[PDB]
């Protein structure tokens, strides 16, 4: 539940938000897309599993973790995206083609949105293009994200949190530097005003020899979190792999329905055929001789048409969309 | 298609940092001087000048390569084996035998020797590529000869193998805006271009 430097926040410009998209995956054959952000979904303040609410990074100086509900998150590329699942950093959703992806938490009027470019296209399987998996059709081998939230496409390494500095922790008065930690908290301070000097202060503390607040830094001693190895955060020196969390929604194999193209009408002439064709959508015709040359030909077809294909005594084979191969022999 | 991991940056903001050598795939790293990066407080350093930064990046297989991945094969002399059904007199038999003129097929009272083929043939070129059951007669580069933006830009003995070798032609650029970040540019996944 850290924050990343999203390149496109709500208004127009980059800024540091809890909802930064860091990577996006769309290899699933149904068009479902997996996303990863800095927020922890399905989790309350302490991290206990609960789907109805999520925790995320706060916009304050004590900078705690604050929570919201599933109703208030929306995702969209061109039209709104429908959520399919969420665990921690990761999301899975199905939604129409577009050029960029956006995730928005709508806390009332506080609608915070992060957008990142990703050219997502309507992708199909089989040899016939289609908007929609048909009700009737061949069941062909496809690979689709598993909606099971306890799966694992892999694993991701996270580390101890890095620096998190503040100048609200610092205070300037009469050209002099003080540190004001939050109540009851031991905050680690470090400065250089000539000599470089460090320390930890738990209360309102003076420093000497310092006139500019830019020369000193303060930050809470937080190791109670694990943060992904993100490039938007300056890191801890001990960046050892301090954990490994699974990548839910594994890309599992299954079977998908694909349509059955038009059954062609063959019109034959001496050592050659004239095949009459109908395909409202892009349909792939692949032909090949069966001799010492294949002479393989391929074509994506829309509308209706007619194709003249010479057939020799040795024979010819063709596949029209997802239909089965058909083989012929001239006389 | 490779996943470009860009580790979290590092700053020694009035000391010095140098370029260490790792064993990661197409490992790239470089050093900048005065940068003075901001993260959320508007300043993450003291001694704003002479502010060395270590910027790094490398690549791995994607977590989804477990399904979508191509494997490169060198084929050799094509051994041909035939299943055969015969009938003689009244009795019939099924048997599977090689065509070499050496290997005999047998059915329990019958012996037969088959081959060699009258005219040898193999539809497979010496260099082939397999992806999800689809075969291509593609001349893939030899192992270790990765080329950026070309097929086989990323190579490894196996998906779980740790000897990931790559030359993706990545180069890391100097940061410009005051906010902390790592800018870089990378060549397109040659796997995707071949796809």
């Amino acid at each position: 539940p850290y924050l990343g430097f999203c390149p496109y926040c709500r208004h127009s410009a980059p800024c540091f938000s809890p909802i930064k998209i860091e990577n996006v995956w769309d290899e699933s054959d149904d068009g479902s897309i997996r996303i990863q952000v800095s927020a922890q979904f399905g989790y309350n303040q302490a991290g206990t599993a609960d789907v109805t609410k999520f925790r995320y990074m706060s916009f304050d100086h004590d900078h705690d973790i604050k929570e919201d509900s599933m109703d208030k998150i929306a995702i969209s590329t061109s039209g709104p995206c429908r959520r399919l699942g969420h665990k921690g950093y990761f999301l899975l959703a199905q939604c129409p083609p577009g050029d960029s992806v956006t995730v928005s938490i709508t806390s009332g009027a506080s609608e915070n949105s992060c957008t990142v470019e990703k050219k997502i296209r309507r992708k199909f399987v089989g040899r016939e293009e289609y908007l929609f998996p048909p009700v009737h059709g061949k069941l062909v081998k496809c690979h689709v994200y598993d909606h099971l939230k306890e799966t694992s496409a892999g694993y991701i390494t996270m580390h101890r949190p890095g620096p998190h500095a503040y100048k609200s922790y610092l205070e300037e008065a009469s050209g002099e530097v003080y540190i004001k930690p939050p109540s009851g908290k031991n905050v680690t301070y470090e400065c250089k005003c000539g000599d470089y000097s460090t320390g930890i202060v738990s209360t309102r503390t003076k420093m000497n020899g310092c006139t500019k607040a830019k020369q000193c830094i303060a930050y809470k001693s937080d190791q109670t979190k694990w943060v992904f190895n993100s490039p938007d955060l300056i890191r801890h020196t001990d960046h050892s792999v301090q954990g490994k969390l699974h990548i839910p929604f594994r890309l599992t194999p299954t079977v998908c329905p694909v349509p059955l193209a038009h059954t062609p009408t063959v019109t034959k002439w001496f050592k050659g055929i004239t095949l009459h064709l109908t395909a409202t959508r892009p349909t792939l015709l692949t032909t090949r001789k069966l001799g010492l040359r294949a002479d393989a030909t391929a074509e994506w077809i829309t509308g209706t048409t007619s194709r003249n294909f010479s057939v020799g005594r040795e024979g010819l084979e063709y596949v029209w969309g997802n239909h089965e191969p058909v083989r012929v022999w001239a006389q | 298609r490779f996943h470009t991991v860009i580790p979290s940056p590092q700053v020694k903001c009035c000391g010095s940092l140098e370029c260490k050598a790792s064993s990661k795939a197409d490992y790239t790293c470089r050093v900048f001087g005065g940068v003075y990066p901001f993260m959320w407080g508007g300043a993450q350093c003291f001694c704003d000048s002479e502010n060395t930064q270590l910027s790094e990046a490398y690549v791995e297989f994607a977590p989804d390569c477990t399904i979508d991945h191509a494997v490169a094969l060198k084929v050799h002399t094509a051994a041909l084996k035939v299943g055969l059904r015969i009938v003689y007199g009244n009795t019939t038999a099924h048997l599977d035998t090689f065509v070499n003129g050496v290997t005999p097929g047998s059915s329990r009272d019958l012996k037969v020797i088959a081959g060699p083929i009258s005219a040898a043939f193999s539809p497979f070129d010496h260099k082939v590529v397999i992806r999800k059951g689809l075969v291509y007669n593609y001349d893939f580069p030899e192992y270790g000869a990765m080329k950026p933006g070309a097929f086989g830009d990323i190579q490894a003995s196996s998906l779980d193998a740790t000897d990931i070798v790559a030359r993706t032609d990545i180069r890391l650029l100097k940061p410009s805006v005051k906010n902390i970040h790592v800018p870089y540019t990378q060549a397109v996944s040659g796997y995707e271009m071949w796809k």
Partner: antibody
Amino acid sequence: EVQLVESGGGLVQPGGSLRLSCVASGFTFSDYRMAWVRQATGKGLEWVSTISQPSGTNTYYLDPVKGRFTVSRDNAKNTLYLQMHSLRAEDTAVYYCARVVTESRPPAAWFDVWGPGVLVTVSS
Amino acid sequence: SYELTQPPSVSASPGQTARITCGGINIGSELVHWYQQKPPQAPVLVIYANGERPSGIPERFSGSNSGNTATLTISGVEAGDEADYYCQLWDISSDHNYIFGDGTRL
């Protein structure tokens, strides 16, 4: 070559005084913090004092050695110094001058270069 | 003031791995450094910042830190490893003091 060489140790009566010296070579003496560390015979390492860089404005000492021992530096001749007053019997030990390599974040300091050390004895 | 405890001795023939533990309250929240010493020679740093090493340290040496325990792990012990080892840290909230461990012998 980076080298630290101590000198000035020896025998002294309790309540006496001494000036231990450490000449430095092979590096920029002004660029690094220095420290005096101590080891009694058969015992572990115990930190004595640290002097900052380049001017050594702020100096830190172990609790019993405050007020009696004072660490100083000279960047011109590249020399660290520790003056001891009111010496006591258990001050008897081998003292090493050691560089301090410190990193701004997380505040963490360690000793990369150590001198061979020199023996001071406090006995009657 | 943090207190560091290590076992007074650890016994290991050559060939296997040896673990030496530094104990102290909440030391996993700080960065530990292990120094190796052969008396009368000066101590040499072998681990710093819980996870890395100076140049020239063989690949067998490794360090870890978590909670109430830090650990120096030395795979494939040899005769030359027989030495003394000090845990150390820099507690700065106690006036920039450098606490060393009691020491352990291999």
